[PDB]
Amino acid sequence: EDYSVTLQILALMTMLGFLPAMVILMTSFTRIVVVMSILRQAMGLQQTPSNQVIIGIALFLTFFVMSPVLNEINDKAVQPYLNEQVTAREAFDAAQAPMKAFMLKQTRIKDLETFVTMSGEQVDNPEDVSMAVLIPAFITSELKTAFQIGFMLFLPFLIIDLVVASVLMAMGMMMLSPMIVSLPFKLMLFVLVDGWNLILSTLAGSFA
């Protein structure tokens, strides 16, 4: 009944091939990158942080926030499987469940309702919905949540820029572009409040 060693290896290599998809569609990678995309866009820098470090910080942030779920998968699924306590079929299910639970904690009821009706299936409990339908609902909630956080992050930088523009216009110099003057002020206020540490607390802790 249990999959043979040859077939289990084939399944293992298959999931490694789809590993980039699982990061950007099932884990918290999508929300972090979108929020960090807003932060770069909000400040006057266009490509200054560069794409490489943002993804690298996002990957490390995901491993931080996915550590509880990854450890739960390790304990429940990997440990019985390594010790040959359980078969491969049930070990795979034991690993799938923590991922499903985490995606439910970061989704909305309205999003699930739309896709479960879209799939044209019958279900009564959100806890046993297929992962094929949970994934589109999860990322849709993630994109909406990220836009909410990004909108809140965009407001203080908009506040600073509007104040500087008003001050320059009030002083009479209708000739100077507000962006050049406002950029150091936005950066200074981003540093002396330790903005990134605050963003870490409101982003890593946003999942719970």
């Binding site: 949540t145 909410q148 956080i149 909108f151 809140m152 992050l153 407001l155 203080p156 506040i159 600073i160 104040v163 008003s166 001050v167 009030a170 002083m171 009479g172 110099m173 206020l189 981003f190 002396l192 409040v193 903005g195 605050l198 963003i199 607390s201 409101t202 802790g205 946003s206 719970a208």
Partner: protein
Amino acid sequence: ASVLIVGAISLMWFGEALARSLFSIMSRLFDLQREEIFDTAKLFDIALGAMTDLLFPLFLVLATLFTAAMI
């Protein structure tokens, strides 16, 4: 010439309070809880609150610019 000088003079004292105003807005809008993020109405309330709290210090500085401009 006089208007820009008084604005700089105003930025000496009013600017420090304006810096405090900007400090509070950034601190609050960065420190969000799970309940605040998931509620759209609460986000707009803080957006209005951060908006209005900005207006009072900004109005004083611009008034200091206007008063010297007439004089």
